[PDB]
Each structure stands twice: as C-alpha cells, then as structure tokens.
Amino acid sequence: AQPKDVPVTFTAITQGVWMHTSMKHMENWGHVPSNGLIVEKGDFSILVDTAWDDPQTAQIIEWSKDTLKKPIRWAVFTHAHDDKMGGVAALRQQGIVTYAAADSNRMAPQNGLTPAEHDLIFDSEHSTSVLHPLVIFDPGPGHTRDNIVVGLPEQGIVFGGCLIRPSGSTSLGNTADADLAHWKTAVLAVAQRFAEAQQIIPSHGPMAGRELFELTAQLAEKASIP
C-alpha cells in the first residue's frame, strides 16, 4: 500500500520524446519526483538527466532496450546534483557516452557524484549541437553556477531543469548553491533562445507552457532585491 520504492514512470511527450519521472524516498515516507527526457535518434536514444540513484537509472536503461527498442547511447546532464547526475556511474558502466558542462564535471566529486566523461564545448552563442537534434544551451548561473538547459526546437520543447520552477511555485526552492542576482537573466536568456517553444518542462511536476518563464523570472527578481 505504502511502497518504499516506486518504479520509474515513462510518459510520451511528443513523437520521439519521452519524459521519465523517478521518486526519491524521504524519511517521512513521502516522495519527491524528478523529470528527465529520453529522445529517440534513429535506432538509439539520448538520455537527458539520470534518476536519483543507480538502480533507478538502471530501470531507464533497461526500459530503453526492452520497451523502446532504442537503447540509450548518449547522455547529458543539466547540473551536478543527485537528481540529475545521481546515476552517472550506471551509465558509464554500460558504455554510454556521457556529457556535462565543464563546471558540472569539476564539482561532481565534491557533491558525491560520478562526473561525466566528456566536457561540453560551447560555441560563442553558448550552444552545442553535439547531441543533435538536441540544442544544449548554457544560460549562465541560476539554480546553480553550472546549470544548462536542453531545447528541442524542431518539436517546440524546452527542458529547463531546476532552472525553471514547477508550476504553482511560490518560492525558488533550495537556494543554497544559487546565484540570485543572475537567475532572472538566465531564465530570460532561455526564453529568448527558444522563443517559439510552447512546451516547457521543469525538473519537478508537470510540463506546462511559457508561463513557467514568467513565474521563475518574477520569483527570481523578487529574491534578488534586498
């Protein structure tokens, strides 16, 4: 009735784009969800963000092989916290090619996380098509110093990660590692880079629209003012 460990759920977002949601068990026996993406690419698939730990990330790998029939071959992570890089070791064990921002790979050891194998190389416009059709974009410090976002401009989807706050949020959440001064600038930079995308996916809760940009911008503006 009250299970400690719940299996990772997979939901179709659009054609060729799946959202994976995993739950972390808390001491009060509640759960906190985290979203990631699986993006089809020919006969294989790209993973955006891991689950909370190795065995939950192992579920995503197995689901991509057994159900999707498109095994994950590449993975990218949006920042160096355990809801995004918690299961990096399980990917590198399976031979997945893993990418992260150079800053995310440097601070992963301190946060008790396995680093990604490759540093992303951004161009002068702070983008990289190394995982096309994903556009990996670096908007600057916000939720963390190292957070990056992933856009799917062909399908009108932005995965904002923790940089974008869940719908209904009245606070910025965990602000221990945040850059309150720059958070609004980073949110607006994402909205301007993917000006057409109508489907915005935060790290927690349901996918929504561009109002998530307004919500996070205003919550960050209010927090930036002493």
What order of strands is seen across the sheet that includes strand 157-161? 127-128, 135-137, 149-152, 157-161, 199-202
> Where in 136-165 is the site for Zn ion (CB under 5 A)?
162
79 is in an annotated binding site: yes
* Nearest residue to 20 (alpha-carbon basis) of 90, 84, 115: 84
Identify any residues that bridge with 181 across adjacent strands, giving them in sequence order. none
Strand ranges in 58-138 using DSSP code E only, listed in sequence order: 72-76, 97-100, 118-119, 127-128, 135-137
By CB under 5 A, the count of residues binding Zn ion is 2
Interaction of residue 6 with a second copy, rule CB under 8 A: no
Longest alpha-carbon distance in the chain: 53
204 is in an annotated binding site: no
> Where in 116-175 is the site for a second copy (CB under 8 A)?
166, 168-171, 173
143 is in an annotated binding site: yes
- The minimum distance between CB 29 and Zn ion, in angstroms, equals 15
Interaction of residue 199 with a second copy, rule CB under 8 A: no
By beta-carbon proximity to a second copy, the closer residue of 50 and 203 is: 203
- Residue whose entry in the numeric block shows the structure tokens 């891991």: 50
Q: Which does residue 81 bind out of Zn ion, a second copy, none, counting CB within 5 to 8 angstroms by kind?
A: Zn ion
Site string for a second copy, 10-29 (x = CB under 8 A): -x---------x-x--xxxx
Interaction of residue 20 with Zn ion, rule CB under 5 A: no
Interaction of residue 176 with a second copy, rule CB under 8 A: no
CB 88 within 8 A of CB 96: no
- Residue whose entry in the numeric block shows the structure tokens 């460990």: 5
Which residues neighbour 18 within 8 Å (Cβ) at sequence distance 6 or greater?
10, 11, 12, 37, 38, 39, 40, 68
Interaction of residue 195 with a second copy, rule CB under 8 A: no
Q: Contact positions toward a second copy, by CB under 8 A?
A: 1-2, 9, 11, 21, 23, 26-33, 166, 168-171, 173, 204-206
The residues binding Zn ion (CB under 5 A) are 81, 162
Residues that constitute the known binding site for Zn(2+): 79, 81, 143
- Binding-site members are 79, 81, 143
